[PDB]
Amino acid sequence: SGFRKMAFPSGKVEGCMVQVTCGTTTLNGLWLDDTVYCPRHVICTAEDMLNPNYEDLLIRKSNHSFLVQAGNVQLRVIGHSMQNCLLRLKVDTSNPKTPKYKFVRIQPGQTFSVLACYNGSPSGVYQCAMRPNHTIKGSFLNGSCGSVGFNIDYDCVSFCYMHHMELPTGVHAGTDLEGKFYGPFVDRQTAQAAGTDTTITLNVLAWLYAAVINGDRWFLNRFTTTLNDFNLVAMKYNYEPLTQDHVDILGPLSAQTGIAVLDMCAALKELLQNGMNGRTILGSTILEDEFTPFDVVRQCS
Amino acid sequence: SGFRKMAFPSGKVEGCMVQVTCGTTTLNGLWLDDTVYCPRHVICTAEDMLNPNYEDLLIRKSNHSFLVQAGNVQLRVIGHSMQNCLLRLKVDTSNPKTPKYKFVRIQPGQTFSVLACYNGSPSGVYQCAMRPNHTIKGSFLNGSCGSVGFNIDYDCVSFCYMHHMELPTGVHAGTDLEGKFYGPFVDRQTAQAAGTDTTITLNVLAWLYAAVINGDRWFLNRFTTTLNDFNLVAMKYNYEPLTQDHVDILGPLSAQTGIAVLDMCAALKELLQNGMNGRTILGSTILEDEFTPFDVVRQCS
Protein backbone atom coordinates (compact mmCIF):
# COMPACT_ATOMS: atom_id res chain seq x y z
CA SER A 1 0.00 0.00 0.00
CA GLY A 2 1.56 3.24 -1.18
CA PHE A 3 -0.76 5.05 1.21
CA ARG A 4 -1.96 3.25 4.33
CA LYS A 5 -5.21 3.86 6.14
CA MET A 6 -4.35 5.04 9.66
CA ALA A 7 -6.32 4.70 12.89
CA PHE A 8 -5.96 7.01 15.89
CA PRO A 9 -4.06 5.59 18.91
CA SER A 10 -6.71 3.79 21.01
CA GLY A 11 -5.22 4.02 24.51
CA LYS A 12 -7.61 6.69 25.78
CA VAL A 13 -10.65 4.71 24.63
CA GLU A 14 -9.42 1.29 25.81
CA GLY A 15 -9.68 2.30 29.44
CA CYS A 16 -13.38 3.10 28.90
CA MET A 17 -14.63 -0.25 27.59
CA VAL A 18 -16.79 -2.48 29.78
CA GLN A 19 -19.18 -5.40 29.37
CA VAL A 20 -22.93 -5.13 30.00
CA THR A 21 -25.16 -8.20 30.27
CA CYS A 22 -28.92 -8.57 30.57
CA GLY A 23 -30.09 -12.16 30.34
CA THR A 24 -28.63 -14.07 27.40
CA THR A 25 -27.55 -10.78 25.87
CA THR A 26 -24.02 -9.48 26.41
CA LEU A 27 -22.48 -6.50 24.61
CA ASN A 28 -20.03 -3.60 24.97
CA GLY A 29 -20.50 -0.48 27.05
CA LEU A 30 -18.66 2.85 27.42
CA TRP A 31 -17.81 3.89 30.97
CA LEU A 32 -17.17 7.62 31.36
CA ASP A 33 -17.17 9.08 34.86
CA ASP A 34 -19.99 7.30 36.70
CA THR A 35 -22.12 6.48 33.63
CA VAL A 36 -22.09 3.46 31.32
CA TYR A 37 -23.61 3.90 27.87
CA CYS A 38 -24.70 0.96 25.76
CA PRO A 39 -27.27 0.08 23.08
CA ARG A 40 -30.72 -0.13 24.66
CA HIS A 41 -31.39 -3.32 22.74
CA VAL A 42 -29.33 -5.11 25.39
CA ILE A 43 -32.67 -5.42 27.25
CA CYS A 44 -34.24 -7.25 24.30
CA THR A 45 -34.51 -10.96 23.60
CA ALA A 46 -34.25 -12.27 20.03
CA GLU A 47 -38.06 -12.19 19.96
CA ASP A 48 -38.42 -8.72 21.51
CA MET A 49 -36.28 -7.49 18.61
CA LEU A 50 -38.89 -8.32 15.98
CA ASN A 51 -41.04 -5.51 17.38
CA PRO A 52 -39.81 -4.02 20.68
CA ASN A 53 -41.66 -1.59 22.94
CA TYR A 54 -38.63 -0.27 24.81
CA GLU A 55 -40.40 1.99 27.31
CA ASP A 56 -42.44 -1.05 28.28
CA LEU A 57 -39.54 -3.50 28.21
CA LEU A 58 -37.52 -1.18 30.41
CA ILE A 59 -40.26 -0.82 33.04
CA ARG A 60 -39.89 -4.56 33.69
CA LYS A 61 -36.18 -4.07 34.43
CA SER A 62 -34.43 -2.96 37.62
CA ASN A 63 -30.89 -1.86 38.51
CA HIS A 64 -30.04 -5.40 39.59
CA SER A 65 -31.09 -6.56 36.12
CA PHE A 66 -27.90 -5.16 34.56
CA LEU A 67 -24.51 -6.81 35.06
CA VAL A 68 -21.68 -4.39 34.26
CA GLN A 69 -18.12 -5.69 34.36
CA ALA A 70 -15.02 -3.57 33.83
CA GLY A 71 -12.18 -6.02 33.33
CA ASN A 72 -12.52 -8.42 36.27
CA VAL A 73 -14.39 -5.99 38.50
CA GLN A 74 -18.18 -5.93 38.62
CA LEU A 75 -19.61 -2.43 38.87
CA ARG A 76 -22.81 -1.63 40.75
CA VAL A 77 -25.55 -0.03 38.69
CA ILE A 78 -27.52 2.37 40.88
CA GLY A 79 -29.86 3.67 38.20
CA HIS A 80 -31.03 3.16 34.63
CA SER A 81 -32.68 5.46 32.12
CA MET A 82 -33.23 5.65 28.38
CA GLN A 83 -31.70 8.31 26.15
CA ASN A 84 -33.07 7.86 22.64
CA CYS A 85 -31.61 4.50 21.52
CA LEU A 86 -29.05 4.31 24.32
CA LEU A 87 -29.35 2.89 27.81
CA ARG A 88 -27.73 5.17 30.38
CA LEU A 89 -26.61 3.13 33.39
CA LYS A 90 -25.59 5.09 36.48
CA VAL A 91 -22.86 3.28 38.45
CA ASP A 92 -21.49 3.70 41.99
CA THR A 93 -17.87 4.03 40.81
CA SER A 94 -16.41 6.79 38.64
CA ASN A 95 -14.03 5.57 35.92
CA PRO A 96 -10.51 6.59 37.04
CA LYS A 97 -9.29 6.35 33.44
CA THR A 98 -11.94 8.71 32.02
CA PRO A 99 -10.17 10.87 29.43
CA LYS A 100 -10.95 14.42 28.39
CA TYR A 101 -13.80 13.93 25.89
CA LYS A 102 -16.69 15.29 23.81
CA PHE A 103 -19.71 13.79 22.05
CA VAL A 104 -19.84 14.80 18.39
CA ARG A 105 -22.20 13.94 15.53
CA ILE A 106 -20.31 13.48 12.26
CA GLN A 107 -21.57 14.12 8.73
CA PRO A 108 -21.82 11.55 5.94
CA GLY A 109 -18.42 10.97 4.35
CA GLN A 110 -16.45 11.82 7.48
CA THR A 111 -14.04 9.28 8.93
CA PHE A 112 -13.30 7.86 12.36
CA SER A 113 -11.53 5.01 14.13
CA VAL A 114 -13.42 2.14 15.70
CA LEU A 115 -12.12 0.21 18.70
CA ALA A 116 -13.79 -3.15 18.05
CA CYS A 117 -14.46 -4.99 21.29
CA TYR A 118 -16.00 -8.30 22.22
CA ASN A 119 -17.47 -9.09 25.63
CA GLY A 120 -15.91 -5.95 27.09
CA SER A 121 -12.29 -6.24 25.94
CA PRO A 122 -10.55 -4.42 23.06
CA SER A 123 -9.78 -6.61 20.05
CA GLY A 124 -8.48 -4.23 17.39
CA VAL A 125 -8.68 -0.76 15.89
CA TYR A 126 -10.09 -0.04 12.43
CA GLN A 127 -10.28 3.20 10.45
CA CYS A 128 -13.51 3.77 8.53
CA ALA A 129 -15.98 6.23 7.09
CA MET A 130 -19.64 7.08 7.44
CA ARG A 131 -21.11 6.15 4.04
CA PRO A 132 -23.31 8.70 2.25
CA ASN A 133 -26.29 6.39 2.91
CA HIS A 134 -25.50 6.52 6.65
CA THR A 135 -24.14 2.96 7.06
CA ILE A 136 -20.65 1.64 7.89
CA LYS A 137 -18.76 -0.97 5.84
CA GLY A 138 -16.85 -3.80 7.50
CA SER A 139 -17.47 -6.96 9.51
CA PHE A 140 -18.77 -7.05 13.11
CA LEU A 141 -19.26 -10.25 15.11
CA ASN A 142 -21.87 -11.24 17.69
CA GLY A 143 -21.13 -9.18 20.79
CA SER A 144 -19.43 -6.35 18.89
CA CYS A 145 -22.46 -4.09 19.43
CA GLY A 146 -21.51 -1.27 21.75
CA SER A 147 -18.05 -0.70 20.26
CA VAL A 148 -17.46 3.00 19.61
CA GLY A 149 -16.09 5.17 16.84
CA PHE A 150 -13.95 8.18 17.64
CA ASN A 151 -11.51 10.87 16.56
CA ILE A 152 -8.74 12.39 18.67
CA ASP A 153 -7.96 16.11 18.74
CA TYR A 154 -4.66 16.43 20.61
CA ASP A 155 -5.71 15.25 24.07
CA CYS A 156 -9.50 15.23 23.65
CA VAL A 157 -11.41 12.14 22.50
CA SER A 158 -14.39 13.01 20.32
CA PHE A 159 -16.79 10.06 20.39
CA CYS A 160 -19.00 10.01 17.30
CA TYR A 161 -20.42 6.50 16.96
CA MET A 162 -21.59 3.44 18.85
CA HIS A 163 -22.40 0.26 16.93
CA HIS A 164 -25.92 -1.13 17.30
CA MET A 165 -26.87 -3.51 14.50
CA GLU A 166 -26.12 -5.40 11.33
CA LEU A 167 -28.66 -4.88 8.55
CA PRO A 168 -29.77 -7.99 6.59
CA THR A 169 -27.37 -6.93 3.82
CA GLY A 170 -24.48 -7.15 6.26
CA VAL A 171 -23.86 -3.42 6.52
CA HIS A 172 -23.74 -1.73 9.91
CA ALA A 173 -25.93 0.90 11.56
CA GLY A 174 -25.46 2.78 14.82
CA THR A 175 -25.96 6.03 16.76
CA ASP A 176 -23.99 8.99 18.07
CA LEU A 177 -23.36 9.07 21.82
CA GLU A 178 -26.61 10.95 22.43
CA GLY A 179 -28.28 7.79 21.12
CA LYS A 180 -29.48 9.26 17.84
CA PHE A 181 -29.27 6.94 14.85
CA TYR A 182 -27.29 7.96 11.81
CA GLY A 183 -29.67 7.53 8.88
CA PRO A 184 -33.40 6.59 8.93
CA PHE A 185 -32.72 3.37 10.84
CA VAL A 186 -34.27 2.20 14.10
CA ASP A 187 -33.24 -0.56 16.52
CA ARG A 188 -35.83 -3.10 15.42
CA GLN A 189 -35.09 -6.29 13.51
CA THR A 190 -37.32 -5.53 10.53
CA ALA A 191 -36.96 -5.40 6.73
CA GLN A 192 -35.15 -2.03 6.95
CA ALA A 193 -33.15 -1.11 3.85
CA ALA A 194 -30.42 1.49 3.40
CA GLY A 195 -30.65 3.98 0.56
CA THR A 196 -28.48 3.28 -2.48
CA ASP A 197 -24.94 4.30 -1.58
CA THR A 198 -22.69 6.60 -3.59
CA THR A 199 -18.97 7.35 -3.74
CA ILE A 200 -17.56 10.15 -1.58
CA THR A 201 -16.23 12.49 -4.27
CA LEU A 202 -14.51 14.85 -1.82
CA ASN A 203 -12.48 11.99 -0.35
CA VAL A 204 -11.57 10.57 -3.74
CA LEU A 205 -10.17 14.02 -4.64
CA ALA A 206 -8.23 14.20 -1.36
CA TRP A 207 -6.73 10.78 -2.10
CA LEU A 208 -5.75 11.86 -5.62
CA TYR A 209 -3.86 14.78 -4.09
CA ALA A 210 -2.23 12.33 -1.67
CA ALA A 211 -1.13 10.19 -4.62
CA VAL A 212 0.41 13.29 -6.20
CA ILE A 213 2.04 14.25 -2.89
CA ASN A 214 3.84 10.90 -3.02
CA GLY A 215 4.97 11.21 -6.63
CA ASP A 216 2.35 9.44 -8.73
CA ARG A 217 0.51 11.84 -11.04
CA TRP A 218 0.08 9.91 -14.30
CA PHE A 219 -3.65 10.65 -14.08
CA LEU A 220 -3.21 14.43 -14.16
CA ASN A 221 -4.13 16.07 -17.47
CA ARG A 222 -4.18 19.51 -19.11
CA PHE A 223 -7.95 19.96 -18.84
CA THR A 224 -10.14 21.70 -16.28
CA THR A 225 -13.88 21.70 -15.59
CA THR A 226 -16.61 23.33 -13.50
CA LEU A 227 -18.99 22.18 -10.76
CA ASN A 228 -21.84 21.89 -13.26
CA ASP A 229 -19.95 19.85 -15.87
CA PHE A 230 -18.31 17.61 -13.26
CA ASN A 231 -21.54 16.94 -11.38
CA LEU A 232 -23.15 15.81 -14.64
CA VAL A 233 -20.46 13.17 -14.90
CA ALA A 234 -20.84 12.52 -11.16
CA MET A 235 -24.56 11.85 -11.56
CA LYS A 236 -23.72 9.28 -14.25
CA TYR A 237 -21.28 7.30 -12.13
CA ASN A 238 -23.10 7.48 -8.81
CA TYR A 239 -20.65 9.95 -7.26
CA GLU A 240 -21.73 12.53 -4.70
CA PRO A 241 -22.24 15.98 -6.29
CA LEU A 242 -19.49 18.54 -5.58
CA THR A 243 -20.40 21.77 -3.78
CA GLN A 244 -18.52 25.05 -3.43
CA ASP A 245 -17.85 24.14 0.21
CA HIS A 246 -16.05 21.02 -0.98
CA VAL A 247 -13.87 23.04 -3.34
CA ASP A 248 -13.00 25.50 -0.54
CA ILE A 249 -12.11 22.56 1.73
CA LEU A 250 -9.58 21.25 -0.81
CA GLY A 251 -7.78 24.60 -0.95
CA PRO A 252 -4.93 23.74 1.47
CA LEU A 253 -4.17 20.61 -0.55
CA SER A 254 -4.46 22.63 -3.77
CA ALA A 255 -2.03 25.30 -2.55
CA GLN A 256 0.64 22.84 -1.47
CA THR A 257 0.47 20.59 -4.55
CA GLY A 258 0.23 23.19 -7.30
CA ILE A 259 -2.94 21.62 -8.69
CA ALA A 260 -6.08 23.76 -8.80
CA VAL A 261 -9.12 21.98 -7.34
CA LEU A 262 -11.10 22.09 -10.59
CA ASP A 263 -8.04 20.68 -12.38
CA MET A 264 -7.99 17.65 -10.11
CA CYS A 265 -11.73 17.35 -10.79
CA ALA A 266 -10.91 17.30 -14.51
CA ALA A 267 -8.51 14.41 -13.87
CA LEU A 268 -11.09 12.49 -11.83
CA LYS A 269 -13.65 13.05 -14.57
CA GLU A 270 -11.41 11.40 -17.16
CA LEU A 271 -10.71 8.43 -14.88
CA LEU A 272 -14.44 7.80 -14.55
CA GLN A 273 -15.06 8.18 -18.29
CA ASN A 274 -12.13 6.00 -19.39
CA GLY A 275 -10.88 3.94 -16.47
CA MET A 276 -7.41 3.19 -15.12
CA ASN A 277 -6.48 0.63 -17.80
CA GLY A 278 -4.43 -1.63 -15.55
CA ARG A 279 -2.55 1.45 -14.36
CA THR A 280 -2.63 1.91 -10.60
CA ILE A 281 -2.68 4.77 -8.09
CA LEU A 282 -0.99 4.41 -4.70
CA GLY A 283 -0.81 0.65 -5.18
CA SER A 284 -4.58 0.69 -5.68
CA THR A 285 -6.72 -0.37 -8.66
CA ILE A 286 -9.92 1.39 -7.60
CA LEU A 287 -10.59 4.97 -6.47
CA GLU A 288 -10.34 5.10 -2.67
CA ASP A 289 -12.94 7.25 -0.89
CA GLU A 290 -12.23 6.69 2.81
CA PHE A 291 -9.62 9.40 3.31
CA THR A 292 -10.92 12.90 4.04
CA PRO A 293 -8.94 16.03 3.07
CA PHE A 294 -8.21 16.39 6.79
CA ASP A 295 -6.86 12.83 7.02
CA VAL A 296 -4.57 13.46 4.05
CA VAL A 297 -3.18 16.73 5.44
CA ARG A 298 -2.78 15.16 8.88
CA GLN A 299 -1.02 12.09 7.52
CA CYS A 300 1.26 14.23 5.31
CA SER A 301 2.23 16.85 7.92
CA SER B 1 -13.93 -3.07 2.40
CA GLY B 2 -15.58 -6.44 2.89
CA PHE B 3 -12.65 -7.37 5.12
CA ARG B 4 -10.80 -4.63 6.98
CA LYS B 5 -7.17 -4.70 8.02
CA MET B 6 -7.08 -4.50 11.82
CA ALA B 7 -4.39 -3.11 14.12
CA PHE B 8 -3.89 -4.16 17.74
CA PRO B 9 -5.04 -1.67 20.41
CA SER B 10 -2.04 0.64 21.00
CA GLY B 11 -2.60 1.76 24.60
CA LYS B 12 0.15 -0.38 26.11
CA VAL B 13 2.71 0.91 23.60
CA GLU B 14 1.65 4.57 23.74
CA GLY B 15 2.86 4.92 27.30
CA CYS B 16 6.34 3.81 26.19
CA MET B 17 7.07 6.40 23.49
CA VAL B 18 9.60 9.16 24.12
CA GLN B 19 11.67 11.63 22.11
CA VAL B 20 15.46 11.43 21.84
CA THR B 21 17.55 14.28 20.43
CA CYS B 22 21.24 14.56 19.63
CA GLY B 23 22.15 17.76 17.84
CA THR B 24 19.92 18.56 14.88
CA THR B 25 18.64 14.98 14.95
CA THR B 26 15.42 14.14 16.78
CA LEU B 27 13.63 10.78 16.62
CA ASN B 28 11.48 8.33 18.59
CA GLY B 29 12.60 6.15 21.47
CA LEU B 30 11.07 3.27 23.45
CA TRP B 31 11.18 3.61 27.23
CA LEU B 32 10.83 0.31 29.08
CA ASP B 33 11.77 0.20 32.76
CA ASP B 34 14.87 2.39 33.07
CA THR B 35 16.13 1.95 29.49
CA VAL B 36 15.39 3.93 26.33
CA TYR B 37 16.02 2.21 23.01
CA CYS B 38 16.41 4.14 19.78
CA PRO B 39 18.19 3.88 16.42
CA ARG B 40 21.92 4.48 16.91
CA HIS B 41 21.93 6.73 13.87
CA VAL B 42 20.52 9.44 16.12
CA ILE B 43 24.20 10.25 16.85
CA CYS B 44 24.89 10.82 13.15
CA THR B 45 24.81 14.01 11.12
CA ALA B 46 23.61 13.96 7.50
CA GLU B 47 27.28 13.68 6.52
CA ASP B 48 28.17 10.99 9.07
CA MET B 49 25.44 8.90 7.44
CA LEU B 50 27.28 8.60 4.12
CA ASN B 51 29.84 6.38 5.86
CA PRO B 52 29.54 6.24 9.67
CA ASN B 53 32.00 4.70 12.12
CA TYR B 54 29.59 4.29 15.02
CA GLU B 55 32.04 3.00 17.65
CA ASP B 56 34.11 6.08 16.92
CA LEU B 57 31.17 8.48 16.70
CA LEU B 58 29.87 7.20 20.01
CA ILE B 59 33.19 7.68 21.83
CA ARG B 60 32.82 11.42 21.16
CA LYS B 61 29.44 11.41 22.92
CA SER B 62 28.59 11.60 26.63
CA ASN B 63 25.43 11.06 28.70
CA HIS B 64 24.71 14.79 28.61
CA SER B 65 24.82 14.58 24.80
CA PHE B 66 21.40 12.86 24.70
CA LEU B 67 18.17 14.73 25.40
CA VAL B 68 15.35 12.33 26.26
CA GLN B 69 11.87 13.74 26.76
CA ALA B 70 8.84 11.72 27.82
CA GLY B 71 5.86 13.96 27.19
CA ASN B 72 6.80 17.24 28.89
CA VAL B 73 9.28 15.68 31.30
CA GLN B 74 12.98 15.49 30.49
CA LEU B 75 14.58 12.25 31.62
CA ARG B 76 18.18 12.04 32.81
CA VAL B 77 20.40 9.67 30.84
CA ILE B 78 22.97 8.14 33.19
CA GLY B 79 24.62 5.85 30.67
CA HIS B 80 24.84 4.99 26.98
CA SER B 81 25.93 1.86 25.14
CA MET B 82 25.54 0.31 21.71
CA GLN B 83 23.63 -2.90 21.04
CA ASN B 84 24.06 -3.81 17.38
CA CYS B 85 22.21 -1.01 15.53
CA LEU B 86 20.42 0.30 18.61
CA LEU B 87 21.51 2.86 21.16
CA ARG B 88 20.69 1.74 24.70
CA LEU B 89 20.26 4.78 26.95
CA LYS B 90 20.13 4.11 30.69
CA VAL B 91 17.89 6.63 32.49
CA ASP B 92 17.47 7.58 36.16
CA THR B 93 13.69 7.01 36.12
CA SER B 94 11.86 3.73 35.52
CA ASN B 95 8.83 4.01 33.23
CA PRO B 96 5.75 3.62 35.47
CA LYS B 97 3.66 2.60 32.45
CA THR B 98 5.98 -0.22 31.37
CA PRO B 99 3.73 -3.09 30.26
CA LYS B 100 4.40 -6.81 30.40
CA TYR B 101 6.51 -7.39 27.27
CA LYS B 102 8.85 -9.54 25.18
CA PHE B 103 11.27 -8.91 22.30
CA VAL B 104 10.53 -11.18 19.34
CA ARG B 105 12.06 -11.52 15.87
CA ILE B 106 9.40 -12.18 13.24
CA GLN B 107 9.77 -14.10 9.98
CA PRO B 108 9.20 -12.72 6.48
CA GLY B 109 5.49 -12.59 5.68
CA GLN B 110 4.41 -12.17 9.30
CA THR B 111 2.32 -9.17 10.29
CA PHE B 112 2.38 -6.58 13.04
CA SER B 113 0.97 -3.20 14.05
CA VAL B 114 3.05 -0.04 13.96
CA LEU B 115 2.45 2.90 16.29
CA ALA B 116 3.75 5.71 14.08
CA CYS B 117 5.12 8.56 16.17
CA TYR B 118 6.68 11.91 15.43
CA ASN B 119 8.91 13.80 17.84
CA GLY B 120 7.91 11.47 20.68
CA SER B 121 4.11 11.50 20.44
CA PRO B 122 1.80 8.85 18.93
CA SER B 123 0.21 9.84 15.62
CA GLY B 124 -1.60 6.73 14.42
CA VAL B 125 -1.62 2.94 14.27
CA TYR B 126 -1.08 0.96 11.06
CA GLN B 127 -1.24 -2.78 10.40
CA CYS B 128 1.44 -4.15 8.07
CA ALA B 129 3.59 -7.08 7.05
CA MET B 130 7.26 -7.91 6.76
CA ARG B 131 7.79 -8.34 3.01
CA PRO B 132 9.59 -11.46 1.77
CA ASN B 133 12.53 -9.21 0.79
CA HIS B 134 12.70 -7.95 4.39
CA THR B 135 11.32 -4.43 3.82
CA ILE B 136 8.09 -2.73 4.96
CA LYS B 137 5.63 -0.94 2.65
CA GLY B 138 4.07 2.38 3.60
CA SER B 139 5.01 6.02 4.12
CA PHE B 140 7.16 7.33 6.99
CA LEU B 141 7.98 11.01 7.52
CA ASN B 142 11.10 12.74 8.84
CA GLY B 143 11.25 11.96 12.55
CA SER B 144 9.26 8.73 12.28
CA CYS B 145 12.43 6.68 12.83
CA GLY B 146 12.23 4.92 16.17
CA SER B 147 8.54 4.02 15.89
CA VAL B 148 7.97 0.37 16.78
CA GLY B 149 6.07 -2.58 15.41
CA PHE B 150 4.33 -5.00 17.75
CA ASN B 151 1.84 -7.79 18.35
CA ILE B 152 -0.25 -8.32 21.48
CA ASP B 153 -0.81 -11.71 23.08
CA TYR B 154 -3.53 -11.18 25.70
CA ASP B 155 -1.71 -8.89 28.12
CA CYS B 156 1.85 -9.20 26.79
CA VAL B 157 3.27 -6.83 24.17
CA SER B 158 5.65 -8.57 21.79
CA PHE B 159 7.85 -5.90 20.20
CA CYS B 160 9.22 -7.06 16.85
CA TYR B 161 10.34 -3.99 14.93
CA MET B 162 11.80 -0.51 15.23
CA HIS B 163 11.97 1.73 12.16
CA HIS B 164 15.40 2.99 11.12
CA MET B 165 15.51 4.15 7.51
CA GLU B 166 13.90 4.81 4.16
CA LEU B 167 15.70 3.20 1.22
CA PRO B 168 16.14 5.35 -1.94
CA THR B 169 13.18 3.47 -3.45
CA GLY B 170 10.98 4.70 -0.62
CA VAL B 171 10.61 1.34 1.11
CA HIS B 172 11.43 0.99 4.79
CA ALA B 173 14.07 -0.97 6.68
CA GLY B 174 14.52 -1.53 10.41
CA THR B 175 15.64 -3.88 13.20
CA ASP B 176 14.19 -6.07 15.93
CA LEU B 177 14.52 -4.77 19.48
CA GLU B 178 17.91 -6.45 19.91
CA GLY B 179 19.04 -4.06 17.18
CA LYS B 180 19.46 -6.67 14.46
CA PHE B 181 18.41 -5.57 10.99
CA TYR B 182 15.79 -7.53 9.11
CA GLY B 183 17.34 -8.28 5.74
CA PRO B 184 20.92 -7.58 4.51
CA PHE B 185 20.58 -3.85 5.24
CA VAL B 186 22.84 -1.66 7.37
CA ASP B 187 22.31 1.84 8.81
CA ARG B 188 24.43 3.68 6.26
CA GLN B 189 23.09 6.00 3.58
CA THR B 190 24.54 4.11 0.61
CA ALA B 191 23.25 2.64 -2.67
CA GLN B 192 21.71 -0.33 -0.80
CA ALA B 193 19.05 -2.21 -2.76
CA ALA B 194 16.42 -4.67 -1.56
CA GLY B 195 16.06 -8.02 -3.27
CA THR B 196 13.17 -8.36 -5.71
CA ASP B 197 10.01 -8.82 -3.66
CA THR B 198 7.45 -11.58 -4.08
CA THR B 199 3.85 -12.16 -3.03
CA ILE B 200 3.15 -13.92 0.28
CA THR B 201 1.31 -17.00 -0.98
CA LEU B 202 0.36 -18.24 2.51
CA ASN B 203 -1.38 -14.96 3.30
CA VAL B 204 -3.17 -14.82 -0.03
CA LEU B 205 -4.58 -18.28 0.75
CA ALA B 206 -5.64 -17.18 4.24
CA TRP B 207 -7.43 -14.19 2.72
CA LEU B 208 -9.20 -16.41 0.19
CA TYR B 209 -10.52 -18.49 3.08
CA ALA B 210 -11.61 -15.27 4.78
CA ALA B 211 -13.50 -14.28 1.63
CA VAL B 212 -15.24 -17.66 1.71
CA ILE B 213 -15.95 -17.29 5.43
CA ASN B 214 -17.87 -14.13 4.56
CA GLY B 215 -19.85 -15.67 1.71
CA ASP B 216 -17.93 -14.90 -1.47
CA ARG B 217 -16.60 -18.05 -3.14
CA TRP B 218 -17.09 -17.45 -6.87
CA PHE B 219 -13.39 -18.23 -7.33
CA LEU B 220 -13.65 -21.77 -5.94
CA ASN B 221 -13.51 -24.53 -8.56
CA ARG B 222 -13.71 -28.32 -8.80
CA PHE B 223 -9.98 -28.82 -9.34
CA THR B 224 -7.14 -29.62 -6.95
CA THR B 225 -3.35 -29.56 -7.25
CA THR B 226 -0.11 -30.44 -5.47
CA LEU B 227 2.82 -28.51 -4.01
CA ASN B 228 4.95 -29.26 -7.07
CA ASP B 229 2.37 -28.22 -9.68
CA PHE B 230 1.33 -25.11 -7.73
CA ASN B 231 4.88 -23.96 -7.09
CA LEU B 232 5.58 -24.16 -10.83
CA VAL B 233 2.80 -21.66 -11.34
CA ALA B 234 4.06 -19.73 -8.30
CA MET B 235 7.53 -19.43 -9.83
CA LYS B 236 5.93 -17.96 -12.96
CA TYR B 237 3.99 -15.24 -11.17
CA ASN B 238 6.59 -14.30 -8.56
CA TYR B 239 4.72 -15.92 -5.68
CA GLU B 240 6.52 -17.46 -2.72
CA PRO B 241 6.78 -21.27 -3.03
CA LEU B 242 4.42 -23.27 -0.78
CA THR B 243 5.90 -25.68 1.77
CA GLN B 244 4.32 -28.52 3.73
CA ASP B 245 4.53 -26.33 6.84
CA HIS B 246 2.34 -23.76 5.10
CA VAL B 247 -0.25 -26.40 4.25
CA ASP B 248 -0.28 -27.64 7.86
CA ILE B 249 -0.72 -24.04 9.06
CA LEU B 250 -3.86 -23.61 6.94
CA GLY B 251 -5.48 -26.70 8.47
CA PRO B 252 -7.67 -24.89 11.04
CA LEU B 253 -9.06 -22.67 8.28
CA SER B 254 -9.48 -25.73 6.05
CA ALA B 255 -11.41 -27.66 8.71
CA GLN B 256 -13.84 -24.85 9.45
CA THR B 257 -14.54 -23.87 5.83
CA GLY B 258 -14.87 -27.30 4.24
CA ILE B 259 -12.22 -26.49 1.63
CA ALA B 260 -9.11 -28.67 1.52
CA VAL B 261 -5.89 -26.62 1.45
CA LEU B 262 -4.78 -27.99 -1.93
CA ASP B 263 -8.24 -27.17 -3.28
CA MET B 264 -7.87 -23.53 -2.32
CA CYS B 265 -4.44 -23.67 -3.97
CA ALA B 266 -6.16 -24.93 -7.14
CA ALA B 267 -8.46 -21.89 -7.00
CA LEU B 268 -5.54 -19.48 -6.50
CA LYS B 269 -3.72 -21.12 -9.40
CA GLU B 270 -6.61 -20.40 -11.76
CA LEU B 271 -6.86 -16.78 -10.61
CA LEU B 272 -3.20 -16.25 -11.46
CA GLN B 273 -3.51 -17.98 -14.84
CA ASN B 274 -6.72 -16.21 -15.89
CA GLY B 275 -7.30 -13.18 -13.69
CA MET B 276 -10.36 -11.83 -11.89
CA ASN B 277 -12.04 -10.36 -14.99
CA GLY B 278 -13.58 -7.36 -13.27
CA ARG B 279 -14.95 -9.71 -10.63
CA THR B 280 -13.92 -8.79 -7.09
CA ILE B 281 -13.11 -10.55 -3.83
CA LEU B 282 -13.92 -8.91 -0.49
CA GLY B 283 -14.40 -5.58 -2.22
CA SER B 284 -10.88 -5.97 -3.60
CA THR B 285 -9.60 -6.16 -7.19
CA ILE B 286 -6.15 -7.56 -6.40
CA LEU B 287 -5.05 -10.53 -4.26
CA GLU B 288 -4.35 -9.27 -0.73
CA ASP B 289 -1.28 -10.75 0.99
CA GLU B 290 -1.08 -8.86 4.30
CA PHE B 291 -3.36 -11.09 6.38
CA THR B 292 -1.75 -14.15 7.97
CA PRO B 293 -3.76 -17.32 8.71
CA PHE B 294 -3.52 -16.28 12.37
CA ASP B 295 -4.95 -12.83 11.63
CA VAL B 296 -7.87 -14.37 9.75
CA VAL B 297 -8.71 -16.86 12.52
CA ARG B 298 -8.32 -14.13 15.15
CA GLN B 299 -10.51 -11.68 13.26
CA CYS B 300 -13.16 -14.36 12.61
CA SER B 301 -13.33 -15.81 16.14
Curated annotation (Swiss-Prot), chains A, B:
Effect of mutating residue 189 to P: In strain: Isolate BJ02
Residues in compartment: Cytoplasmic: 1-301
Localization of this protein: Host cytoplasm; Host Golgi apparatus
Catalysed conversion reaction: TSAVLQ-|-SGFRK-NH2 and SGVTFQ-|-GKFKK the two peptides corresponding to the two self-cleavage sites of the SARS 3C-like proteinase are the two most reactive peptide substrates. The enzyme exhibits a strong preference for substrates containing Gln at P1 position and Leu at P2 position
UniProt domain Peptidase C30: residue ranges: 1-301
Active site: 41 (for 3cl-pro activity), 145 (for 3cl-pro activity)
Chain's role: Cleaves the C-terminus of replicase polyprotein at 11 sites. Recognizes substrates containing the core sequence [ILMVF]-Q-|-[SGACN]. May cleave human NLRP1 in lung epithelial cells, thereby activating the NLRP1 inflammasome pathway. Also able to bind an ADP-ribose-1''-phosphate (ADRP). May cleave host ATP6V1G1 thereby modifying host vacuoles intracellular pH.
Known partners and oligomeric status: Monomer. Homodimer. Only the homodimer shows catalytic activity.
Protein name per the record: 3C-like proteinase nsp5
Annotated organism of origin: Severe acute respiratory syndrome coronavirus (SARS-CoV)
